[PDB]
Amino acid sequence: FEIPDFYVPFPLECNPHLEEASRAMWEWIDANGLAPTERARDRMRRTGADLSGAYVWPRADLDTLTIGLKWIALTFRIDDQILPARMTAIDELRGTLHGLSPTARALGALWQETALGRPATWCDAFIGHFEAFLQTYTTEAGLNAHGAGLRLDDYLDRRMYSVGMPWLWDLDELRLPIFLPGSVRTCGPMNKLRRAGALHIALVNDVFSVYQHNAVTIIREAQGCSLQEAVDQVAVLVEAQLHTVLQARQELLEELDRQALPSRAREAAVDYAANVAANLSGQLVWH
Numbered sequence: 411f412e413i414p415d416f417y418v419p420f421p422l423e424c425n426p427h428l429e430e431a432s433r434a435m436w437e438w439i440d441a442n443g444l445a446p447t448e449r450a451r452d453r454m455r456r457t458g459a460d461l462s463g464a465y466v467w468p469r470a471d472l473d474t475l476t477i478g479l480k481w482i483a484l485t486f487r488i489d490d491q492i493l494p495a496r497m498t499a500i501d502e503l504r505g506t507l508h509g510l511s512p513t514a515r516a517l518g519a520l521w522q523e524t525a526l527g528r529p530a531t532w533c534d535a536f537i538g539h540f541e542a543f544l545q546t547y548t549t550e551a552g553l554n555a556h557g558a559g560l561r562l563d564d565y566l567d568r569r570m571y572s573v574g575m576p577w578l579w580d581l582d583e584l585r586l587p588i589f590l591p592g593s594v595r596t597c598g599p600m601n602k603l604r605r606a607g608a609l610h611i612a613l614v615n616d617v618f619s620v621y622q623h624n625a626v627t628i629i630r631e632a633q634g635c636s637l638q639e640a641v642d643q644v645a646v647l648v649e650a651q652l653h654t655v656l657q658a659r660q661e662l663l664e665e666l667d668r669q670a671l672p673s674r675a676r677e678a679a680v681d682y683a684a685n686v687a688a689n690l691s692g693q694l695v696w697h
């Protein structure tokens with residue numbers, strides 16, 4: 411099939427601190443036994459975790475980028491090492507986030523470091539997004555036990571979390587002049603932006619990736635159409651997500667005015683939303 415010529419209008423941004431943050435990431439990996447064999451070290455090298463982070467958080471300072479790369483490296487290792495066996499592994503990880511395996515121990519320590527001195531509303535948002543991400547491993551294994559075709563709408567509802575965007579973007583708040591107020595983080599336009607941006611990225615990933623849990627496959631198997639025809643339909647969905655991102659950004663500006671926020675908070679919210687938009691270009695280029 412012919413891969414669509416995906417176009418995104420937002421500038422392509424990459425973090426200038428990649429080389430230094432990558433050395434700090436690898437040092438943490440080494441310290442934690444997250445790549446305890448050369449096989450594992452080679453898989454880690456080949457995943458491009460560091461480059462991935464430099465595209466997720468292009469505007470971050472070195473300290474924020476470095477913490478973000480630790481999360482990406484950890485999640486790579488969790489993914490590498492992954493229905494009852496999945497539930498058991500996932501529940502042990504989830505437990506660590508509540509103070510309840512070198513990978514699980516690393517997660518609990520990394521969470522302690524991340525939460526320290528960070529506001530409770532942010533911590534709760536990050537945990538919910540991270541737990542939603544982890545739970546997708548169990549959801550998809552459950553669905554695999556069923557005979558019926560997958561529903562696209564339910565797939566997208568889980569895919570916005572399995573792509574990881576939501577918790578990744580939570581970490582972008584660490585580089586802002588202040589954390590988002592709770593009334594901005596979970597306002598209508600921000601939720602719309604977060605979902606559409608996450609789905610744009612994920613659906614582009616699905617096209618480059620095409621395991622049943624893929625929008626291309628789901629459409630093809632439901633309709634009995636050709637692979638190219640299913641791809642073209644996913645391209646239409648992607649364009650829809652783009653236009654939803656564009657709309658939500660405008661709507662966010664209006665909502666910031668309705669809240670009568672301090673200038674610092676308005677600025678932080680606009681910068682966060684520009685980063686969400688940047689990621690549509692960065693992650694397209696990464697794929």
Ligand SMILES: C=C[C@](C)(O)CC/C=C(\C)CCC=C(C)C
Binds near residue numbers: 462573615
């Ligand atoms: C994941 C989304 C992208 C878009 O494919 C890459 C970003 C970061 C990675 C993979 C770490 C977080 C997510 C997992 C392991 C799939």
